[PDB]
Nucleic acid binder design. Sequence first.
RNA 1: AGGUCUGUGAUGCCCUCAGACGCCCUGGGCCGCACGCGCGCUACACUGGCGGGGCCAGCCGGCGCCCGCGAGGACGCGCGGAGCCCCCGCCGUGGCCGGGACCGCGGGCUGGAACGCCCCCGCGCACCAGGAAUGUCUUGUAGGCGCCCGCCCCCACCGCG
RNA 2: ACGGAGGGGUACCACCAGACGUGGAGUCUGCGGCUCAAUCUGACCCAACGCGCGCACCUCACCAGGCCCGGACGCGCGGAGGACCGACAGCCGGGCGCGCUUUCGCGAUCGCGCGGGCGGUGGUGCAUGGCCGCUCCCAGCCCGUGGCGCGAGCCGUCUGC
Lengths: 105, 85, 32, 209, 103
Amino acid sequence: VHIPKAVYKAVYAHLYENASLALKEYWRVGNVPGITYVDENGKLCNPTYLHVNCIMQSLESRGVVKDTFAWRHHYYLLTEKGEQFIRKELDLTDDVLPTPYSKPS
Amino acid sequence: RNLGSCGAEDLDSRVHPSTIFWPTEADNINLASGMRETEFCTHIAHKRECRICGNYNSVYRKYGLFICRRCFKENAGKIGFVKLH
Amino acid sequence: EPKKVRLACLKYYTIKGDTAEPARHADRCHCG
Amino acid sequence: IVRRDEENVYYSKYLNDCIMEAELHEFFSRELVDAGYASCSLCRTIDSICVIIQCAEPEVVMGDNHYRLHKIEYLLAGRFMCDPKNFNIWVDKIIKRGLSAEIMVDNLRAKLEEAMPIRRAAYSIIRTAMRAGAAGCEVIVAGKLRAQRARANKFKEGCLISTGHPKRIFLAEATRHIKMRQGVIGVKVRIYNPNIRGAVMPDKIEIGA
Amino acid sequence: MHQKYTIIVVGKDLKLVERYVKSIVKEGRAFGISGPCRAPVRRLTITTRKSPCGEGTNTWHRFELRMYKRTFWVTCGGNDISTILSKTVVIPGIQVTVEVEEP
RNA sequence: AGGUCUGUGAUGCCCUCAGACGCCCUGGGCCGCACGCGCGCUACACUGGCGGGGCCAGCCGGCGCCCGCGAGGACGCGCGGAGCCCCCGCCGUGGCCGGGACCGCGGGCUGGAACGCCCCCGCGCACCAGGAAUGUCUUGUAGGCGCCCGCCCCCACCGCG
RNA sequence: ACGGAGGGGUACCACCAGACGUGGAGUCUGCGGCUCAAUCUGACCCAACGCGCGCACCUCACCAGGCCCGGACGCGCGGAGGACCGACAGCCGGGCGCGCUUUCGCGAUCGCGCGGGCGGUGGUGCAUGGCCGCUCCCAGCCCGUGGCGCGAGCCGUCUGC
């Protein structure tokens, strides 16, 4: 619950770069192998499931992203509003766009 | 309690260093990397569960599925299993 | 359920910015 | 003469991708209902992944500038630990929708959630199927339609076979669940087409004079 | 130049696996490849109770999965690194029939 | 109104909802026993028990060297099939070498932790073909003999074959 | 639908002719009762009783005790002249800065009231879907035109082989 700002920025940046978040329905103690950050820790460290789950819950409840549970994985996707929000925190400007807008190829 | 310590004869008898043979069952990497944190989930044990419905009872580990039996007759056709003979 | 103690001008350790300390048992800020 | 522990690598490498296929099918069926998603097929290539979808109208899911689809590709890269840009998705379209039960049942659920009467909707589906070319179609609705006591009524038209191996080909069945105010309403469908793919049913004899 | 190569094929349906074969062998007559070694069939078996609960007579389901395997390793010197791709393209790619190659 | 809300991000209506029926930890129980019965296992012995030897299956399948009576253990490599049965002998109608329940020292394995499971010595319960009642079965069938998988950290008198 | 009514047929979940058993002993296991703090429950003729795929921890619901909020999201109020959260040492506590006696640390990730959530092996299977079992180890069921009846209905769909 005492989530550092670095985790917030890392999550948001991964969101923007892949416009997505294929997360797991997990509640024990563990580390996400994808998103990673290097701050205070001094090296690119993973975050813990509890923090990210709380953050994404807040995001969804706020309408920024929407989910689509299937088996045991959460699949989130961000909307136009979310794009118009994430852009603000990461010091972005309107012109910059997410990567999938362009061709994956 | 970071400065406490006991008689060495009481410290040669600690447990075997070779960690533990009780790791959780993780199907993929997405699960994990490996105050209350001191004891939130220290009870480390297998928790293998249906990768569909997340249930710890009646899980077919055979062939590395990890699929409950009730959560299996539905998807058998999709997977490829067919009911003949 | 111990409750905090009010914060105040404990920096007056020095009469006039003599830069002294940057107490019971000698403990470090946090660990020891 | 040979070691059975090596070929088990290939065998376990063909089981994993089958399970990968089905999870995708569930995900699609739960998401791409507006595009009339029918089914999914996958050609595991050593270079990448190529996925061939079956939707009634891909242009919807295809998305302006292919934005939605490209968003989707990146997403599945995270879950399957595959590098994005190697998860190319190809869309395909269906023409004889009346020949497919899944599309019609999705349409039926859509109608029903509007509070549209059950009889009119079911018979619309049925005349649709017979217009597209069909030798039969049966429909069902079970639940708490009106009163607390629950009973089921079924509609139909022409013959439908429900026995043998032929039921594993010429007979396509489908079902869904509907969550309404009173409670779960259950609907299921089946269409019989003996002339699909130019396959001849047995116990059938033609003679020329 | 010469490398001694092997081709693996796997599948769950007998028709495609018997159709991929004809195409590949017809395509490789020149390079010197020869027919397959049909391997023992791998039988996956599962018996499950037909009910989600214990009731009535005890009736069982019997699911199975057959996996078929054909192995051409007769390219070897007859085919160089580049020429292998010549053979893996003219064939009619099928949506489900993993084919692995290894010298 | 057969069973299943205790399989599920299947679910309507009620009740729980910060001293929580939420989630996590430490112990215990689900195995507790004067008693009635349902599916099985082992036996009541000479058409047999014991000791030595010879020898053939299929679903399918992993082995060498050295310690230790054995169970097991330390090393290192990829390689592989049993009971009944047959032959030679001991016993010689005795609740006896039939039967191995129960119990007393000991040596090991699993595991974070034996209450769990194996091996050795000793002890050696009923049981002499089972009343009223009752079940299954027509060719590779009944019956007899053993062998693999399921769940499983160890454990099969169970079940599918 | 039924008949201790008649006439034709049929099947080792019926019998004839036979075989192998069970019910008798000890034991494995499940089931009712008794017990306990708890011995968590479902199912009761065929159509419940080695069945709901192996209970030392988990599984786990039950018993005796203890940490955490993991209270999303909007309105009013307060908050950095400091919202919330941790720790050395010593006691008490099974143990943990759980709690008690001081005294250091971190910093808005918020807190309080109001609305509103999430979650729950909590109840109703006599409110439901789906899935199974049984009727059924059967041989039966219905359509268009036409005809007979005011009509419920009948013929078609067979008092023959």
